[PDB]
Symmetry: C3
Subunit: 314 residues, 3 copies
């Protein structure tokens, strides 16, 4: 499939530092090389350089808003470009706040997109319901047309225009949702498979109804925003907000294998890999390796195997 | 939901000491506080004080029978009271022998109850089939009307009257069942989902058929007796009789979330947490944390999230 | 069930040494004793002695072919004998190359056999598609009638006659398949449940369709060739070629419990246990213990429990 890689070494959507190193440790792992060893056409659009914004005091409770805002604005511009170049955007994070710009720029070029949000969290707090103020826990609230009217003018986000409606997104992996978030969920009627539903139905049925839900009326570009804390920390420990009882390694590969097979993946986020937070070097490689695997599955790597259209018996 | 907490610091239904500390480490973990942070009405009926019975030689093979007998008698009285106070009894164990008194006192007030027994073991040995003599491996045999006639008069249990028939109980998680126990199982036609059935059907279908089985003729109070060794030891290692290939963290939360949603939970046992047996401090907290999670799920904590009937967009 | 145990302490189908010790560590674990403690009739046909073949240079890329060839020839003779003695052959490996002789000798006596191949790998490289040259990655290619014509005359395998057609085998657990192998898979239309299919359907449905597929036209002897790397390395780490995201402990017991219940198991391979490769003594026992469990399940040990046709209430 044909890919446009974008490094997004940004961390100020949350408090812990090393998330900005994600694009580095992923590239170090040979992500680009392994993509090419596959059926892949790969163009690297570099690491965005996110100039410091030293004057950035909180807005109400909301932390680093100018910094988060500009980084998303920057990224949105860069995503629209690779989408215009006919390529699937691959955003290497970075904290999940970047999704505001990733999904924003994607939809500039493909407004009909649907979003699959794999995450232990809904990340839909508004600047009024957040308790922490960390913007990586708010991106969805900025993107939703229905929450227009409840999102104050925060410095650095004036460029934003809600691009997705409640019925255009599906959540998978939820297990730590705030009350205001849950209210928003039920109130806007958003489609979700929490860990309970995954337990109930099986990841097979979950993907079936996810894809049917989003693609049923008709085929559309898909945006996969993947928070590695959606997966159990026994798989992705080096991450800021881990929550036990997550998606397994297998379920994570199942999700992305099935998304690959639609042929509709148009944009991908690989978010929240924080090498500084593994308590061992092995925790770091375990996380990075898992994140590479998930990424490769998005672009055709299949556990049953892969072969080119040649005769191998020769 | 509205709860009556009962500490049951008792261990002589089995040989290893620290099970008596379960109510302590659970309370230490903030169980009561977290319950209240939920939708919960919580009354603490204290830790029962179980006076020593120093003269208590075996009855045949059966170990500490007067001690086990009186502790269950004591607890039964205390459970009936909280049930009379209109509250769900929460028994913090303690070894599983206590279930004799827990289910006994429950049924004093609600004789129509049905029992869900989550456990790697059937705990249905009789004083004649047990090999070990440990009474925590016999509670079900004392409660079953059908085994009346096969249960010798053991000192300390004269107060007992079988209160549940074979068709009123379901087992979930079985993976170490003795031969005599298996005989009893097939012979009395008891309903069970062993790990094999959980593997086959999925915990979703298991709960569906469990609840249908017990509630189908008509709605009834449910008694959940939860042996933490039902869950894999990678989740609940600090426990006396661990058996590999158990229920997952997720399956354990699935079970209790579904039991919560019936609105019929009337009595709960949280049993066999033994902090002395974790090989590390982290094994101890891992166990305790898991046991708190399972407990909170029984009383409404949902992985998809929870909110109060207020408008959160304000 | 009635069993014929064969030790096969052979390693030259792959490069790492200690696989030859598998029959030793399994016997050490009390495999024979535990079999007998079950409903089992057990005859030990000893450890085959595999005389050195010091002159054995590669054939093309193919490594140790005379050694691998003779060991399989030897074993095939020994398997046919126990099959003639009316016993289920239990081959204790040893590397998976031995399957050439195991399935070869089995089919001498029961040509209608069907094969269940539990493995992370398809082990179907031919001497022309292998990259490594290790014969433990080629046994299936030697056994398949359809690949007759693509398998050069390799020294030490002149005795071989393909005994199974593509439609007579099922794979379960696949997650590291080469391109040429995948080509062969699709091209010969071989039935497989890769980890993706296991994720999709559940191991319940997988076994249902596996057994239906193979037994549907009519009942037949089953050959189970079990590579312990089919199971996740968190279960079977001491093994040469581990691949993450494998079959669970539970799924492994599910498979063999269901195979047992057909009453048709006629031959079994327990392969690739390498005690030298555990990074701890506990990794070694964890592997060996898992391998014993899987083995016992093949012969009737059930997680729901087992009892003899006697009255246990006495
Ligand atoms: Mn998250
Ligand atoms: Mn997130
Ligand atoms: Mn138990
Ligand atoms: Mn128990
Ligand atoms: Mn293998
Ligand atoms: Mn193999």
């Amino acid at each position: 499939r044909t890919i446009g890689i974008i490094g997004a070494p940004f961390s100020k959507g949350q408090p812990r530092g090393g998330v900005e190193e994600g694009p580095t440790v992923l590239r170090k792992a040979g992500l680009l090389e392994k993509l090419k060893e596959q059926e892949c056409d790969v163009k690297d659009y570099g690491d965005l350089p996110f100039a410091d914004i030293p004057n950035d005091s909180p807005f109400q409770i909301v932390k680093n808003p100018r910094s988060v805002g500009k980084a998303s604005e920057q990224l949105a511009g860069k995503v629209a470009e690779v989408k215009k170049n006919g390529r699937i955007s691959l955003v290497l994070g970075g904290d999940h706040s970047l999704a505001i710009g990733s999904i924003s720029g994607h939809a500039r070029v493909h407004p009909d997109l649907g979003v699959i949000w794999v995450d232990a969290h809904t990340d839909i707090n508004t600047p009024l319901t957040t308790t922490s103020g960390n913007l990586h826990g708010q991106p969805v609230s900025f993107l939703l047309k229905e929450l227009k009217g409840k999102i104050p003018d925060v410095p650095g986000f004036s460029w934003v225009t809600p691009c997705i409606s409640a019925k255009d997104i599906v959540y998978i992996g939820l297990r730590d949702v705030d009350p205001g978030e849950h209210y928003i969920l039920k109130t806007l009627g958003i489609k979700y498979f929490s860990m309970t539903e995954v337990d109930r139905l099986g990841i097979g049925k979950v993907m079936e109804e996810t894809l049917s839900y989003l693609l049923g009326r008709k085929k559309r570009p898909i945006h996969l925003s993947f928070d590695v804390d959606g997966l159990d920390p026994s798989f992705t420990p080096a991450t800021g907000t881990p929550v036990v009882g997550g998606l397994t390694y297998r379920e994570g590969l199942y999700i992305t294998e099935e998304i690959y097979k639609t042929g509709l993946l148009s944009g991908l986020d690989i978010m929240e890999v924080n090498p500084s937070l593994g308590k061992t070097p092995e925790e770091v490689t375990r996380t990075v390796n898992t994140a590479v695997a998930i990424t490769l599955a998005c672009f055709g790597l299949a556990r049953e195997g892969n072969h080119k259209p040649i005769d191998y018996l020769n």
